[PDB]
Amino acid sequence: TGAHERTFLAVKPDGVQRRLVGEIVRRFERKGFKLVALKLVQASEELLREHYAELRERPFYGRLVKYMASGPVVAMVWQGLDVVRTSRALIGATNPADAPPGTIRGDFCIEVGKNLIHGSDSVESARREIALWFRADELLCWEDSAGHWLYE
Amino acid sequence: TGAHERTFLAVKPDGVQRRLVGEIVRRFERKGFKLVALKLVQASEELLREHYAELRERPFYGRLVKYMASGPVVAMVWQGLDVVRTSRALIGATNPADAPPGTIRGDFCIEVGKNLIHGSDSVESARREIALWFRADELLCWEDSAGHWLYE
Amino acid sequence: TGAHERTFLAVKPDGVQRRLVGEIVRRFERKGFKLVALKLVQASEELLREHYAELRERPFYGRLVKYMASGPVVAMVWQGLDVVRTSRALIGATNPADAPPGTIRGDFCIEVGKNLIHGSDSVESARREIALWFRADELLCWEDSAGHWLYE
Amino acid sequence: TGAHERTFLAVKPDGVQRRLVGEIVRRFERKGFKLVALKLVQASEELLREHYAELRERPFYGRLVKYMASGPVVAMVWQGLDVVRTSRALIGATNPADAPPGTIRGDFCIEVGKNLIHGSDSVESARREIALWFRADELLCWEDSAGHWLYE
Amino acid sequence: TGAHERTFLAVKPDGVQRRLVGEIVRRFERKGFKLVALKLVQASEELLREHYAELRERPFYGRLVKYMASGPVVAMVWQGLDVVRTSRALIGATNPADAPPGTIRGDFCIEVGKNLIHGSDSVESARREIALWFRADELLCWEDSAGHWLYE
Amino acid sequence: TGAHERTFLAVKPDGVQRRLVGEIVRRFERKGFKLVALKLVQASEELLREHYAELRERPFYGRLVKYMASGPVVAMVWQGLDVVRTSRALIGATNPADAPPGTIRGDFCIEVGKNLIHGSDSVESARREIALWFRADELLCWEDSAGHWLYE
Ligand SMILES: O=c1ccn([C@@H]2O[C@H](COP(=O)(O)OP(=O)(O)O)[C@@H](O)[C@H]2O)c(=O)[nH]1
Ligand SMILES: O=c1ccn([C@@H]2O[C@H](COP(=O)(O)OP(=O)(O)O)[C@@H](O)[C@H]2O)c(=O)[nH]1
Ligand SMILES: O=c1ccn([C@@H]2O[C@H](COP(=O)(O)OP(=O)(O)O)[C@@H](O)[C@H]2O)c(=O)[nH]1
Ligand SMILES: O=c1ccn([C@@H]2O[C@H](COP(=O)(O)OP(=O)(O)O)[C@@H](O)[C@H]2O)c(=O)[nH]1
Numbered sequence A, B, C, D, E, F: 001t002g003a004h005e006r007t008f009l010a011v012k013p014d015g016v017q018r019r020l021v022g023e024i025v026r027r028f029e030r031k032g033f034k035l036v037a038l039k040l041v042q043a044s045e046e047l048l049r050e051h052y053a054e055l056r057e058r059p060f061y062g063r064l065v066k067y068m069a070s071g072p073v074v075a076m077v078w079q080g081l082d083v084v085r086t087s088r089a090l091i092g093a094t095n096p097a098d099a100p101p102g103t104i105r106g107d108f109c110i111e112v113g114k115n116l117i118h119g120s121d122s123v124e125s126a127r128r129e130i131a132l133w134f135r136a137d138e139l140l141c142w143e144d145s146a147g148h149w150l151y152e
């Protein structure tokens, strides 16, 4: 939806425990994206198994699901032009060893299993993840007065 | 409840619009308090009238309610020793003119009607506000690994 | 003039040399004040003797004038409600030893003669200083889209 | 010129409105470059048409000129070794979508038309732009005590 | 000794564990004080009992000694005008509940037993503590190029 | 040694003089590495000639040795997975002109001779440099409570 494109991000348990929620949110805010949903939740294994359905055959799947269910996550939806692709760039490579300094994982993480945050990998993935984690009435439309200074 | 004391905070519409959500959360995180609930909501006038019931006879009540209903707020609950009183200190005086530099309002605001954030003014106020804004199942218990370094 | 009140600030040579110009500007920006004039200048002794006319009988006058003429300063005008008094609070006490942490001098300076910045001490002082340092056509009126979130 | 190389930078209207002037200045300061001119101006369309003469055949030229004339810009000259090329690197690609995190545009912008800042693209361009925007007597020589720690 | 006054600071185990060493050092650096000694050590109970000799009859003494011996501390000596008194101001009140925002303890701590840092409380205390924790040959004299911009 | 890998880092004299010690330490802290040794020292030419033995035939060797002996350095050892390689990435290319923004040299330096920091270039180099700069009893083992959130 051009500037109405949306992505799903989640601060993983390690991000909450290391007190980096503010830091992470601040990076998306300063970039210009619009926060349209946010909540702290404890996700069920049932929800996480669907979230990570595509990874079901992978050897880390079981531990990934257990870990993501082990503590609070901060679920979020962000809106803006190219937000899915750009979010992934801000976050950095899956494996923090390949994420350059300046990215979230490049600055804050070491190991792939403790890489702070999840972000949708495509517009289609984001659509699915947003619907899985949030009801329609948790996604807010608000008139963004900053928008005039971010978009032509 | 000692170290289990809780307070309710809300980033007002001006805080969201000015992109200070991360900045505000980061201040409470770095202080050591535990985030136990968080959501972006559009509060109803009905909720706000009860939230501000003690101010009903004051002439700014109506415009305060309308303003707080005018756009998204970020509702939060924070836990720790003396969190209500300490939160109020971090926020600063109601009127930003009286809030010293180092406080949120001292650093970021000018006028009383645009003062970025609400915080409970007492343990009793927090009890009521927490119940009004959040269900029990939105308040998360998590084992805080930082706690050993914040509390004796 | 209410929200149209203006003050004159100058980053002294120590602030330029220590690379704190950005830092200082950012504190006024984040507070919500409107930047209406800015320039890097080398002030003449003639200008400075009049700028500090009220200090002419004081023993530090001569050295203060010579110092402020010794290198570039960053001259500025900021606009907003109570900007003169609030600016002075953000800056902190004249003698940095009495300036609490959170203030510019509290955070960044040690000695009274190297205290980073000048700010007008009154609306009348600001009127004079603005006229003395800037032409009317250097003071810019611009429509401040942040103003809606700083003022009722 | 070596370490005396100079570039012209301007914070565009979006940078002023979003309160990123100090943030931008601070990045050049912390890098070690020397600020040799600075002013807040409202540029005429006449000046801007000459500034962007090489872009006259491009479809965005008209809107670019109108936009840059629409509000204050912060004009600047910075001095140091390789300052033109290095400035461009710190700013990031023209299109923020191609600018990595860590760059100004990578961190703060989304769209090409709202990309915060202009920087000269060559030593020759900088010479022209500096002369177009500043008089000789606005470019200051000062003894930079940090220079001993930036240059061998 | 005027500008040659020195104080002893130590980042307590909680400060190391919470990753606030750099943050703390940066505050003294940005203030203008001169770092003249620094090391990561594990203090013995024997050293700490003498360090806190004046507190020997107090009920928290035993736990304070055990805690400070429980993990690494970062020992430091800082030099500058009024450094003992000013350090204490930057650190904030012993009990973080009384330490305003802007101070280290005001911003980063909650409880008196986990208050991040020790600073000498007097010139006499600093003399003793410096001698107890560091040899003369660990205290470095260096020519401080920033000094001209901090001191008249 | 996996997560027990260690590297040697030193803040060069320019890093101390420009007050970037805290800033540099903070970057390694926030990345998740464990600080296992730290001291401010004045290195002898004899030690530095061995430190840089591999560069003995290079034309900058003499000046490099003299410079590194000219003022205090902050010697450090950091521990964690892939710490040698990752440290080098965080620091950035030898020549700051090739170091992107987000890296220490990319953000803070201009010239190769004033590039703020040394980091070992291999596990073998780190082992040698650690032995050359530190005694065994200066390298501290401590139980890292953050480790659970950085490593699986
Ligand atoms: O060897 C691996 C690869 C991936 N993951 C985790 O699986 C998550 C989702 O995997 P995916 O390949 O989808 O990466 P993403 O798209 O989240 O970067 C990652 O973010 C990692 O935390 C893991 O634990 N081990
Ligand atoms: O004259 C006033 C007093 C208060 N308020 C607003 O009303 C809120 C609640 O007022 P209260 O007296 O409860 O102060 P608080 O508890 O928020 O410090 C404040 O935070 C202000 O935004 C206002 O607009 N005008
Ligand atoms: O004993 C003194 C008092 C003042 N000043 C300097 O002179 C400036 C102007 O003095 P004034 O009394 O106007 O203080 P201000 O209004 O700047 O706080 C101060 O900012 C200091 O930099 C000084 O060097 N010594
Ligand atoms: O397709 C385009 C290309 C450029 N620009 C704007 O035009 C400015 C100047 O264009 P130029 O190609 O000179 O880029 P720059 O030198 O600023 O990177 C850019 O910075 C953009 O703001 C635009 O709006 N659309």
Ligand SMILES: O=c1ccn([C@@H]2O[C@H](COP(=O)(O)OP(=O)(O)O)[C@@H](O)[C@H]2O)c(=O)[nH]1
Residues within 6 Å of the ligand: E055, E060, E064, E093, E094, E112, E113, E114, E115, E117, E118, E119, E121
């Ligand atoms: O009731 C108390 C008082 C003090 N302390 C600890 O003991 C240290 C030293 O106490 P002192 O009175 O010397 O305070 P300081 O000089 O550190 O402010 C403090 O910093 C606290 O960490 C404590 O645990 N409980």
Ligand SMILES: O=c1ccn([C@@H]2O[C@H](COP(=O)(O)OP(=O)(O)O)[C@@H](O)[C@H]2O)c(=O)[nH]1
Residues within 6 Å of the ligand: F055, F060, F064, F093, F094, F112, F113, F114, F115, F117, F118, F119, F121
């Ligand atoms: O042409 C050169 C190359 C290197 N160096 C300095 O010598 C140090 C060691 O050089 P080396 O190639 O070992 O680089 P490093 O491993 O430190 O990146 C560098 O960090 C520079 O400070 C220099 O002055 N000139």
Ligand SMILES: [Mg+2]
Residues within 6 Å of the ligand: A119, A121
């Ligand atoms: Mg994935």
Ligand SMILES: [Mg+2]
Residues within 6 Å of the ligand: B118, B119, B121
């Ligand atoms: Mg209230």
Ligand SMILES: [Mg+2]
Residues within 6 Å of the ligand: C119, C120, C121
């Ligand atoms: Mg005055």
Ligand SMILES: [Mg+2]
Residues within 6 Å of the ligand: D119, D121
């Ligand atoms: Mg161009």
Ligand SMILES: [Mg+2]
Residues within 6 Å of the ligand: E119, E121
């Ligand atoms: Mg004491």
Ligand SMILES: [Mg+2]
Residues within 6 Å of the ligand: F119, F121
């Ligand atoms: Mg090398």
